[PDB]
């Protein structure tokens, strides 16, 4: 894809195995990748939601799982869910607006 | 052995006679009516509470899709289980949301 | 309203004192001992049978991880529900495996 | 990654919405992408397992979900799980051998 492509919405999580680090310490480096990426996101208890260009988002996830390894994880189980609607795109707001009090 | 868990789930219905958002709305209604703490996300809905109670919520959400007209449903679930202390939404997200300042 | 479903699940344990493969082995043992048709895959294990029976299998597999030494477990589940006819493993895979010739 | 990188094992599924096609017809085009890719795979009832290079496998998944759209899907929900162990790699056989009668 490129910056013109219609948006996707995605969620992902990383579950690391680390011999000498606490899980939360390793996960914090994965979330840092998300925080530093520039894309709209929201961290949830089980999954982090992303919105933006497909290839940009997949690269965020790849770098997030690598951040876990760089932080001391020997391995990572990474889960991804993608809502793909390339014709007109899909957004966080269209999926959650009915269900959150912050929306009018 | 705490049965307090955090769980996320989603339902992806097939419904020939319905727009999928309307079907999913009835699944979300089960969650809304349950009494448990929850948050609807773009890809999955997060729940907090007793394992068995939450599993029943998900089962009924799946059934609600069929009752709303779905021919079939693909239901995804993820559970964080930690019986030593239980697991909560706030423990997992406090570092990562502005609302926790 | 057939409750015959196909389900996949996985358990990803944290266990400071154990190699994770050994912990997961005890979860797979619950599946092996259940009596339901199953197949272990690299990323998830597939089950076929009654919805409630299968959910109980997964719950006990998750518990087996803790009993084997896991401090916590992330359990993933996916259910294909189609009460008009039920859903089976063979209906989903027959086109795609050589063993079905 | 490149062809030298240690292997990953991955599973994925596509759940399409198609206004004028049966789900199985659309999914068959996604599995065709897997079949035509050259990588080791196994189709399961809920997920298809892949083994090989990370970027090659992610490209297979991207093309699989696009095949659904080309086949008439208006949108697709795509799920991915990755076992990432870049040091020494991870294989299908190491995870399933104890649990299948075909292994000695």
Task: Describe the model.
Four copies of one chain form a homotetramer. With 104 residues, the first copy, chain A, is an alpha+beta fold. The first copy, chain A, has a single domain, classed as 2-Layer Sandwich (Alpha-Beta Plaits). Chain A has helices at residues 23-37, 54-70, 92-96, and strands at 8-18, 40-43, 48-52, 73-84. Chain A has a four-stranded antiparallel beta sheet. The N and C termini of chain A lie far apart (33 Å). The relative contact order of chain A is 0.28. Chains A and B meet through β1, β4 and α3 of A and β1, β4 and α3 of B. β4 (73-84) of chain A pairs antiparallel with β4 of chain D. The PDB classes it as structural genomics, unknown function. Keywords: Bacillus cereus, structural genomics, PSI, Protein Structure Initiative, Midwest Center for Structural Genomics, mcsg, unknown function.
The tally of beta strands of chain A, per DSSP, is 4
Number of helices of chain A: 3
Q: Any idea what the shape of chain A is? A: globular
Assembly type of the chains comes to: homotetramer
N→C terminal distance of chain A: 33 Å
CATH architecture of chain A: 2-Layer Sandwich
Element order of chain A: H for helix, E for strand: EHEEHEH
- Determine the fraction of residues in helical runs of chain A and give it as a percent range: 25-40%
Largest sheet of chain A: 4 strands, antiparallel
Biggest interface reads: A-B, 24 and 24 residues
Q: How are the strands of the largest sheet of chain A arranged?
A: 2-3-1-4
Fraction in beta strands of chain A: 25-35%
Name the CATH class of chain A.
Answer: Alpha Beta
PDB class: structural genomics, unknown function
Keywords: Bacillus cereus, structural genomics, PSI, Protein Structure Initiative, Midwest Center for Structural Genomics, mcsg, unknown function
Assembly: tetrameric
Entry title: Structure of domain of unknown function DUF77 from Bacillus cereus
């Amino acid at each position: 894809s490129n910056a013109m492509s219609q948006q996707v919405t995605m969620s992902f999580s990383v579950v690391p195995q680390a011999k000498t680090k606490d899980v939360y310490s390793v996960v914090d480096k994965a979330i840092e990748v998300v925080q530093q990426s520039g894309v709209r996101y929201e961290v949830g208890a089980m999954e982090t939601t992303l919105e933006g260009e497909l290839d940009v988002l997949l690269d965020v996830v790849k770098r997030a799982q690598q951040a876990c390894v760089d932080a001391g994880a020997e391995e990572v189980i990474t889960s991804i869910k993608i809502h793909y609607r390339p014709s007109t795109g899909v957004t966080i707001d269209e999926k959650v607006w009915k269900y959150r009090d912050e929306y009018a």
